[PDB]
């Protein structure tokens, strides 16, 4: 109970910034995560014996894929921590508790293929969940790990607080389905502009938490140029793997996913920053002003991809 985690000085300071990289030392990520829980939430939130067992079972159920891995899990949780620490008073104790666990669990058992590839493959999970296929799986695995003897980090809540938190986590995890991001953002757009956004409306909060989740999930585009650029290879290595498996099914994959069209990547990144990242971080900044640094970083990186195209690297 009197046992804080402490980080070396440089991490202690840099972890509070949106653009923190968690580093190449696997073995420090669990301590990073706990550290963030203890400062976001309190040393009380979770029994340390149980948090640690939960964290290690979650680590175990992420696979060795290029991008959709344990590192992504912890990275996305850090971004949610940065958002929660720059917006101290806007979120309930339950919401701080739920959302950090949501982000750690959000990609549980990912194999590195899109919802689409599951549907064209006719994978069993596409029979069992027609929309938001991997995300309903991810929520499912989170509940499974929550139910292992020794792993219920929520056991100290009330029947009703318990049901609220699992409902926060489920919406949080389903919202990472980028197909759903577009309308979620258009609606928050209308609601902020007409002036009807109201954070005491639960369904308004849901939408806002959903956009924070998209923001954290994409946060690799909000890093310093060299982190953003080296992560983009991981993200593309999965895309190209999927393009190959598309070709194996006798389907020409989209160019994004075709490893024969690497040349078109820098223009592809442009589309994505323009169609997805910049709008996500704009609306989020409007709703939560202190998250502006994610917009500024995203813009710097768009600029860096423009240079890649203009032959200046
Ligand atoms: N084409 C894409 C698709 N999804 C992406 C996600 C991140 Cl975080 C970064 C770059 C991406 N580029
Ligand atoms: Mg995902
Ligand atoms: Zn993710």
Q: State how far the alpha carbon of 223 is from the alpha carbons of 15, 19, 58, 172, 297, in Å.
A: 13, 5, 25, 23, 6
Position 85 in a domain: yes
Q: Is 68 a catalytic residue?
A: yes
In a domain, 233, yes or no: yes
Q: How far apart are CA 278 and CA 98, in angstroms?
A: 26
86 contacts 290 by C-beta, under 8 angstroms: yes
Domain-located, residue 293? yes
* 72 within a domain of the structure (yes/no): yes
- CB burial of 159-181 (b: ≥16 within 10 Å; e: otherwise) equals eeeeebbbebbbbbbbbbbeebb
d(CA 165, CA 163): 6
Residue 19, domain member (yes or no)? no
Helix axes 159-175, 93-105, angle to 10 degrees: 50
Residue 3 lies in a domain: no
In the set 68, 78, 137, 151, the catalytic residue is: 68
Using CA atoms, how far apart are residues 134 and 59, in angstroms rounded to an integer? Answer: 17
User: Taking Cα atoms as reference points, which of 9, 4, 112, 128 lies closest to residue 62?
Assistant: 112
d(CA 228, CA 47) in angstroms, rounded, equals 35
204 annotated as ligand-binding: no
Provide CB contacts within 8 A for 299, sequence distance 6+.
278
- For ligand 1, say whether the CB of 272 is within 6 Å of any of its atoms: yes
Q: Is residue 280 part of a domain?
A: yes
Phi-psi region of 23 (alpha: psi -120 to 50; beta: other; left: phi over 0): left
Report the distance separating Cα 202 and Cα 200, nearest Å.
6
Exposed / middle / buried, residue 68 (Cβ in 10 Å: 0-12, 13-18, 19+): buried
Q: Which range of residues forms the domain containing residue 93?
A: 28-310
Residue with tokens 């293929």: 113
In a domain? residue 132: yes
Report the domain count for the chain. 1
Helix (H) or strand (E) holding 246: helix 225-248
Please provide the size of the chain in residues: 313
- Residues contacting 25, CB < 8 A, separation 6+: none
C-alpha 105 to ligand 2 mean position (Å):
10
Determine contact, residues 199/208, Cβ cutoff 8 Å.
Answer: yes
Atom of ligand 1 nearest to the CA of 256: 1
* Burial class of residue 13 in the structure, from the number of CB atoms within 10 Å of its CB (0-12 exposed, 13-18 middle, 19+ buried): exposed
Resolution (A): 2.5
65 C-beta neighbours (distance < 10 Å), count: 18
CATH of the domain at 117: 1.10.1300.10
Q: Please, what is the Cα angle at 205 between 204 and 209, to 5 degrees? A: 125
């Amino acid at each position: 109970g009197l046992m804080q985690f402490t980080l070396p000085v440089r991490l202690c300071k840099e972890i509070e910034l949106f653009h923190f990289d968690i580093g190449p030392f696997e073995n420090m990520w669990p301590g990073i995560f706990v550290y963030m829980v203890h400062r976001s939430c309190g040393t009380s939130c979770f029994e340390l014996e149980k948090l640690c067992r939960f964290i290690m079972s979650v680590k175990k159920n992420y696979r060795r894929v290029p991008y959709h891995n344990w590192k992504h899990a912890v990275t996305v949780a850090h971004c949610m921590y940065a958002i929660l620490q720059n917006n101290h008073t806007l979120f309930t104790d339950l919401e701080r508790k739920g959302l950090l666990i949501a982000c750690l669990c959000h990609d549980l058992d990912h194999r590195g293929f899109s919802n689409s590839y599951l549907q064209k493959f006719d994978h069993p999970l596409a029979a069992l969940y027609s929309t938001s296929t991997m995300e309903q799986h991810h929520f499912s695995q989170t509940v499974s790990i929550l139910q292992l003897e020794g792993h219920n980090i929520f056991s100290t809540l009330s029947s009703s607080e318990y049901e609220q938190v699992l409902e926060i986590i489920r919406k949080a995890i389903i919202a990472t389905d980028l197909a759903l991001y577009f309308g979620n953002r258009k609606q928050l757009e209308e609601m902020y502009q007409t002036g009807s956004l109201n954070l005491n409306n639960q369904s308004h909060r849901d939408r806002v938490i959903g956009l924070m989740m998209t923001a954290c999930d994409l946060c690799s585009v909000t890093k310093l140029w060299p982190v953003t650029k080296l992560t983009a290879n991981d993200i593309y290595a999965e895309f190209w793997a999927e393009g190959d498996e598309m070709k194996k099914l006798g389907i020409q994959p989209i160019p994004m996913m075709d490893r024969d069209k690497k040349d078109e990547v820098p223009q592809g990144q442009l589309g994505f920053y323009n169609a997805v990242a910049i709008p996500c971080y704009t609306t989020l900044t409007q709703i939560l002003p202190p998250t502006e640094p994610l917009l500024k970083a995203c813009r710097d990186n768009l600029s860096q991809w423009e240079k890649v195209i203009r032959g200046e690297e």
